[model samples]
Target chain A: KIQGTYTAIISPFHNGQIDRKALERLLEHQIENRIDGIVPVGTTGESPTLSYEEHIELVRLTAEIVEKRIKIFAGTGSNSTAEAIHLTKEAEKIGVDGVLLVSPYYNRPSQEGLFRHFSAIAASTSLPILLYNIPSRCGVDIAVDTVKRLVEKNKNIVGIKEAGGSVDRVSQLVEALPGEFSILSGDDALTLPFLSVGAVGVVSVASNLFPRPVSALVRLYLEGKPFEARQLHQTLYPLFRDLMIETNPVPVKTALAMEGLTDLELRLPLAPLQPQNLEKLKTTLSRTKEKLAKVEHLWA
Target chain B: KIQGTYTAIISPFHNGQIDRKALERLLEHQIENRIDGIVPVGTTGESPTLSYEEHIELVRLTAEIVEKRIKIFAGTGSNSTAEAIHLTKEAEKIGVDGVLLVSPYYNRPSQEGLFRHFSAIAASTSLPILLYNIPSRCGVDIAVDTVKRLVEKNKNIVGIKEAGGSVDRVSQLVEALPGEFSILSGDDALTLPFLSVGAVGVVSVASNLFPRPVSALVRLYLEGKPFEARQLHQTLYPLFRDLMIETNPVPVKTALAMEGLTDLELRLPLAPLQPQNLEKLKTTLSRTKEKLAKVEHLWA
Candidate 1:
């Protein structure tokens, strides 16, 4: 059912290049913590910055390391239809479990344009497809009617990663399609509320740092353990809010550097967090880590 | 000064390939009508769908045909800093007059991050650089403070194509930057309003079809011919509004097809106009053409 937390893991870099060793470090952490799955090369993963070769190589590395331990939904979307088709077919060839196709960005398509592009990509792949609808960045909203239409025509089109941040939209989604179609939250802070309203899981950016709590919150809710999930949600809430203090991945990538896992190196167009913001992240993260350390037994 | 009307020229296609002959047809129209310059491979040019080869080739073809009859500002921007640098350098090599560098989209860089990436690109090129600020699609605004800093430091960093749809922001731009820096309105509808306030010219989509009037309107305004410019504006206003009926080039491309200049062929992500919108455009366009015909002697 795609019903658990999936980390939109970062594509770590060192000295302006993809840091393979650090990427493995992040991967092993996710696998060790039993994340529901890993969505590499996603928005959180800096998919916009990675070259075509680097994107595929990251997928190959993740597939090689995880080795069926958990699911691998490789992020493969392009503003170009031909490129999207090529990426989808390549991911399928590399043997990943599925693909996350974010709607075309920079070139805002109309609803019908959105449908045509989505359908063209859906037709090209047999691998399970998840539509990524983040209008804030993509500049166009895939209409609810369009989603319903997209779902009905393509059997392989299974779910959505709803990043629009409206919980009521989740309800509309729950009511719309066949019950088997997955509706996953794209926000970490809203994961609990999204789940309360019938979302199946999350494609989480926060979980790239703390998979256990993030995944545990989802698993706890789905397991009918509301009280425990609420408790963990309270503990993890500050980190959730803090991670987004900046654009994304900047703060999350910094959080990893704070833990001594990797350096705070990011590709250009994404500079280091401002010092004042960095101070806030350090304070919020340490406080959340203290809260997490004590409550380890809840999820353990 | 980067003043007067410059067409953000559409790259015409035939059977999914760059329609070289049809493109020259559009070029001849712009030149024969006296456009100030042409910004080819721009947002109106369906740049996102263009391959690297197609993008460069479009610039090359525009250069080949124009022969300095008018200025050429090739569109070159990317979410990746390195890619943006590469494209800027390549546009320089192809020997256009200048380059339009849109701020990184999809990634949503911070203000400082915006500064860093823009600085990197500015450092890599000696060509006159025009900043493209369209926050609606880019998901980030290159702030006034950042714009001033970019101009003050980079000798080549000249002006911005403000597409944020705020005339107030254009006034703010007028206040913040150097007086010589060109503040061009990116919206065709606002061209008159933006110029009434301090904007020098427009990077217009409407001009792709009606270069004579579009170019003349700006020249009329700058030449102390406000009454005539306003007269031209009244006639062209309907077209400015209708061209935006759908997402951009779709309506504009269809406008060209309606005029029998080219077929209604767009790249995949941009579909042909819906019949209802098409009907509205046809009605609006024919009426405007009638008005322009009677007023032809004004610009002539």
Candidate 2:
């Protein structure tokens, strides 16, 4: 029944390390703005660059700071099954609400391999498991049949973050899996279309900056206010499109930096957004601000 | 100058561990068959499943068994830049001839990120670096522009194993990079097409089971015998196609198992091939065997 906007929040860094103070401030912003949940250590969180210690500390500190104000779905996927299990078990120990297991990347496993991979992780913990399917990143899709199979076998396997970019897949997933199985949109741009089909909510990157509008759009749609939701969606569509002007978190992080939220510091192998793209983001953000002013009452 | 068939070799596993005796036997088979090089611990080696201890041990053992008889290009890419550096350094210490760094998977870095990632690794080691671009597995392409940038900056960066499934990419890469920078096909089925463009050789999975013919296919082409190479490619293309009936190493390992080369024991997260698909592979192999018999004179 996961049915609202959840921020795939970023990890703020200072002096090449996880800045706890900045992270806490970001988390508090999500809480105050009424985001339904938080997914830390996700791709948007810069999980790959985080040391194992920093990864765990972020999850632990997130759980402590949120204090049950919202849900916490920690990203605990690794190419290695044993490592994924160990990370999931550790995140459980930190008392997070659930775990998001991205399909094994680099080692492009077959559908059967994906089944065994997720089943093994699901068996190791009692916590709810959400499959994160971003084939553009993982190089393998958790096929609709595989999702149906995984959910059938493991009751703890609950939902999927469908980032495959096909709204039709949301329909296929809904039709194949049990109705209770939650399907959350992984893309911010397609959230409305996904909801039109059957997705309950979104695991969002845009929500990191515009928590109120993103969540309000989803809440309005779920509350049978589709028209209002559509308007908000139209207003926010440019930001959604631009956030991905580059590979995610880069553009989103850059937008946040413009607002003085954090510095434009990303780890090696994740260089800063190129300067030309930065200019594009600034223009888009300014235009988005003007639109948001008009739709201010939607948040109220 | 790594200009011949290189088998991305399978790691023989026994009772869920590296079977050293069988591994050595496989190595001997490659040497005896006249493979130009052996790429141990690439994706075909089930690298994601291999423990770090086993990874280093296999590279060491491979160096010892091959004794410089054939080049060894160790698979040593990690999503973490530091981990990739560490593994590349260790592989160098074990005396591999080159290192195959699969573009960072799962994290899906930008082209700028990829340039920096590769530059950093290339700087950390003195060994010739072969960029392995299998976007299907790594979820990121080392774009032609990025490849040019990497080779321009790092003299140690020698060539690329282009497995992104585009013969046109081979054309683009060849058009963009230095004339001496080698381009090798990463897919067996695309070997002829890739070489038809500019790729000099293959990092082949089919070579694992049929080294002589696979090598002959490339050797014939490189030896100014395109007609004979096409005949060999057509003869062996069925195998190249069938071996990928499932994910790599699955069908390849299974084919080897039928030949009594190794047991059918893949690590978890890489399940055994489906029963129906296994039957399909058996039929394809039998048909391929008959065809190969007709073209036996080529390898001879």
Candidate 3:
């Protein structure tokens, strides 16, 4: 059961190359702040733009640096099933803790097609799989029924990162999958509400900037302190909302660069956050600083 | 200014290779049926599964067979902006009349990112570009504002294939652009209603099976025969509706196989139509056979 905060870490690029030193620093920061897992090469990681060599290199390096200290859930999803199988097999070879398989995008498949796609991939490897369902990006949902179907057939298929933004689905998934099949929130803003409906934790984007506070919120909830978690969520809500004011990692990466963590850079096709959104993000980040400071000692 | 029915042709496969004989036969069928254009390598053509070598070969071969008898709008979109640019350049080298660039998928770029992405591709070649906005598949709409901006920046961006499935958006785009920027329906069932609201024609999947009637539907409306077009649309609506009974090319290709045009084959991640949908497709095709027979002379 993969519970607790998993930072969908952004790949830091400098001078058109992976700034490996910066990535190591980011990983150490997450470790110090106590994130449970790291998911590199997800949408937040700009996996689409990273070259194949860079993708594998980052996963390999993350696995190496973590040294079994934290879980590694590498994003190995692809619209092409064969390509996904190949990537997943390589990630397994590199000893990733698991793989996050996003639903096929662009080439939207039928429900039956989606079933076969995941089933074939699940059969190919022994690694635990977290099915990623973000219809907003992938243009398809791993419907609760499809998830049920996959889990029924493959014992290694373990959980899902649900980002459909509907709390009701959390209830439906929790009700349907019943035991051992985990459902984690994929959005930061909805994490508490999702938890209220039985989602166990989040694969968080906001955690890339404030890992301690993000993980603390999830920990508080799972620790049977829902009221405390709600309070923390209220405090962090503005930051979560603003982090996505632009399209994900753009604003999160910009916040990291502002904190002097990485260069203010993103690959082409994912332009830098617009000026207006930047101003809003800065205001939101500034306001959350005081709140984040209160939770910083959790790691200490 | 390309208009009328343009079949997003399927790649015929036999024994795990491009069935060139079948492809040539399909091409001859479209030519004899008088489709206004042939869009090779589009999603309907299963572009995601095709390799770079196969992609270029398909485009090169389509251009040769087309030989200016009909236009070629190659599917050259990619989630990677650089890859889109590279494919678009190669497509230009093959002398494709235009390229249909589906907005960056999976990555879900912001509106500004979308603008920059298309602008960069448009600047790289002189080939006319058709911006494909099928947010249902791509997960992001190249919003009306982004399209306007791209058109303002690049004279070579001439049109769009609007498959977002809203007829009102066709009116909105038609009203907003207000000029030489052609708006073509990307859905077969919506073509008449889209044309009712100002879409010029269709980049059709149903046309692969019934090019004469699909072409006739657009020609009727464009030739100022709206009543006749409406009648044709009503008669053909069930076929259009059933062609999409499964994920795109599945039902379409199955129909093609039923007509003895090609083998029933699809690449992985895109499975064959479900049994129930196959029955529905056959029923729908059977229902439309009489009406199609009436217009069979259009191809003759």
Candidate 4:
């Protein structure tokens, strides 16, 4: 199972196609920056726009590049049960360590449907599964009870990325679920708060830009250093806040582009961030960089 | 353009398929109720689960049964811009008087993206387009300014079904757009207040069970019968509020099944209303039906 910090890697696009070169560069950046793990094509990657071929490629390529040094967690979720099973199976075949399966979105199923959906996907692979519950995007909450039930039913679903915007949920999960059932913060701004409860680390969007800071914060918390984590959280909160200023990947992608990552771009309908938000993002970046300079700390 | 009171008609499903006989019966009820218009296959109809062929057939069957006695406003919205365009064009070819297009859900496009999405769809067909702006389901509000801009740019884009839950927005739309630019309430609970703020009528969910009363409420408000409309709103407020107890049409559909309009069976993902909510729906329905009987309302 993926532990510590995991960056929800953004898929770099060039001229309406996946930028293989940019992706290679991004993997290098994550490795060089010492991010603990990588979750490719998670919602932040604009998984919706990635064709099935591109999805498998991203996962397989990530596994190839990481060379077992870091965990490669691939997003293989779908609203359709069969489709999710198919995708999860493919990701398993690609040799990724785990699949990040999001609950169904617009076609919000019942709790039972969710159990069936995830259980079916879990059965499709021997690869460890990380339940990704970001209800805001998916329009369906995998309830605390449902998560507990899923774990009872599926041995492969070892953890969850909880983005339900509640520290209380993290506490409940930690209290109710077995110690081995790891809980990770799916939201960046809530990382420190979640860790205060029981979340081990984050499946982070802000990490795409400031991987070192986020990973360090998680490491600090893991080492019984809450104050250090809080310090990092306070410093990085602006960037975390900006990451959500206009939906996922927009702010993160813009930051990556500013830092000269793969010509950060989005497919049609996702569009670029609005001008005012772009200016805000730039300010967040400048402030983040300024704070980075003052700190004696840096990525491995 | 299709105008006046319209029911975003709920699809009556039985044994996991369109209950055609029940659906036709429901349509006949709307006609006998003398509703001004009807929208088939909307979210209220659980559009996401319907196969494409079923979606098309439902619209066709709805239009055929109505026989132009009342306008047939088909709900053909999708999150995929291309899919929406394809569906809208098909709806146009089917000779539906208008197509109700909900904003792309899950994807959460920007204002510019929304404008482009709608503008592209508008140009694709001469079918009078009624934009459905329900941000809660979609995760992005089509801002008033953007709606106005879309109206200005796309002539065939006749009006909006404002479901974003704000009376202030209704007022803003009336103030900003020309008098001819139609604004309809999308929520049953807010129908009177929305009409009070200049909305012509609602594309109602409550209409599924009590079409005549819903139409009566709208007519009462439009004819400056605020007191009467408010009276009805208060009387039916419980049903209105409870019908949305879970999600659009879930409670309504359950109530309909109880009234013997159709089976209570829903597609997978959308289970039967929770037992407590089902009990609440029953209590509200009893009270509403009693009120309807006492009022001695008739469609004609």
TM-score of chain B of each: 0.97, 0.98, 0.96, 0.96
Global local distance difference test of model 4: 0.82
CAPRI tier of model 1: high
Count of residue pairs whose backbone atoms collide, per candidate: 0, 0, 0, 1
In candidate 1, which residue ranges exceed 4 Å CA deviation? none
Model 3 lDDT tens row, B146-246: 88889988999999999998998887887778567899999988898888877788899988888888888888898888888877888889988887777
Better model by DockQ: candidate 3 vs candidate 4:
3
Worst 10 residues of 3 chain B by lDDT: B291-300
Of the two candidates 1 and 4, the one with more favorable lDDT, higher being better, is 1
Estimate how well candidate 2 is docked, as a DockQ score: 0.73
Q: How much lDDT does candidate 2 score?
A: 0.90
Interface RMSD of each: 0.8, 1.2, 0.9, 2.4
For model 1, residues A133-194, the per-residue Cα lDDT tens digits are 89888888878888999988888889999999889888998888887989999999998999
Q: Candidate 2 has what TM-score?
A: 0.97
lDDT of 1 by residue, B120-239 (tens): 998998899999999888888989999999888889899989999899998888899878999999999898889988999999999988888888899889888899999999999988
Q: Sorted on DockQ, highest at the top, how do the candidates line up?
A: 1, 3, 2, 4
Top of the candidates by lDDT? 2
- When 2 and 4 are scored with TM-score, the better candidate is 2
Model 1 chain B poorest 10 in a row by lDDT: B259-268
Against the true structure, whose TM-score is highest? 1
Give TM-scores for every candidate, taking all chains together and pairing residue i with residue i: 0.98, 0.97, 0.96, 0.89
